[PDB]
Amino acid sequence: ILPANYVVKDRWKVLKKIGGGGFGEIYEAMDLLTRENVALKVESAQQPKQVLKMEVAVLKKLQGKDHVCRFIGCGRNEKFNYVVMQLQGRNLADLRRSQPRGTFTLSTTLRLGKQILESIEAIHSVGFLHRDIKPSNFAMGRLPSTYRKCYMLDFGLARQYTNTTGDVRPPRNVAGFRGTVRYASVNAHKNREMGRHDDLWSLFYMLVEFAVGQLPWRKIKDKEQVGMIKEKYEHRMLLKHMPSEFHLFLDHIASLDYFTKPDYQLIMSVFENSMKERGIAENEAFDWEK
Numbered sequence: 001i002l003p004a005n006y007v008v009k010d011r012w013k014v015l016k017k018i019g020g021g022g023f024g025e026i027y028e029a030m031d032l033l034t035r036e037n038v039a040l041k042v043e044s045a046q047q048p049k050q051v052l053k054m055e056v057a058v059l060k061k062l063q064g065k066d067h068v069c070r071f072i073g074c075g076r077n078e079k080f081n082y083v084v085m086q087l088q089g090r091n092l093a094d095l096r097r098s099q100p101r102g103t104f105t106l107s108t109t110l111r112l113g114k115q116i117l118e119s120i121e122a123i124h125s126v127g128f129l130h131r132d133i134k135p136s137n138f139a140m141g142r143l144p145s146t147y148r149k150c151y152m153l154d155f156g157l158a159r160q161y162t163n164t165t166g167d168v169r170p171p172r173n174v175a176g177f178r179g180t181v182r183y184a185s186v187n188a189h190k191n192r193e194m195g196r197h198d199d200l201w202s203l204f205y206m207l208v209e210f211a212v213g214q215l216p217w218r219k220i221k222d223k224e225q226v227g228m229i230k231e232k233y234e235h236r237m238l239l240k241h242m243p244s245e246f247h248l249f250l251d252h253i254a255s256l257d258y259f260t261k262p263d264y265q266l267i268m269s270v271f272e273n274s275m276k277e278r279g280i281a282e283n284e285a286f287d288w289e290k
């Protein structure tokens, strides 16, 4: 879409593409007013998708919370809509690729899991589901105060599950899924309305992939095939080389439906007890700091 050295609205000079192909394209850009590098996400106003407006709404509702990028600006024209946000470092999928065996140490995996769980709690606390939890949607900070912090990205698939009063809206009988196949829960595969527990299913799949390097359905492209494996796969065997406490995490989320609030502290305890058991210190160096 936007070429290099294109200047959005005479302020944001495109430098490179850093991601795209989903509901949007995101660029690293130079903010010519502040002279600071920023992230610039663009959506064609001609796409079927019309999401960036709610990305900003979610983004400003989470402003100030940890693991959330700062909103810098947004705008629209006849060709595309855009949002400008704080630039973060490399994403967790990139970092996992660049590890020699495609795996993180358990020290990194468990401490990442704690941070991602916190950000999932955060967006759930403002009444929104993420619905596209995956490694490429999390990135480490890029500043001296943020580089050991994980940042939640891409609210383009987010949906409000509460209403104005804090009550939970009824789920639809069916809901289309337009997210990423690899880390979707079986509920998502079955076009069921996603709930808070489905964001946690994605976290569970992420952490298994981090520690083990792969998921059984890694190569499989056909979505509707992928759901069939997950529906038939015995998930306890994913935990062969995970800490034993992950059985509690698996058992809990497998028990949930759309209507039941997750026991977030149970999952947090699984991570924290796993770390204490291996003597993993919170301030230990991450794998890529090595």
Ligand SMILES: CC[C@](C)(O)C#Cc1cc2c(cn1)cnn2-c1ccnc(N)n1
Pocket (backbone or CB within 6 Å): 018, 019, 020, 026, 039, 041, 055, 056, 059, 069, 083, 085, 086, 087, 088, 089, 139, 152, 153, 154, 155, 156
């Ligand atoms: C988070 C709010 C919003 C507007 O919904 C979004 C988004 C978004 C950001 C994305 C990507 C996809 N979507 C891919 N990379 N990336 C990066 C990479 C480096 N820094 C930053 N800030 N974002």
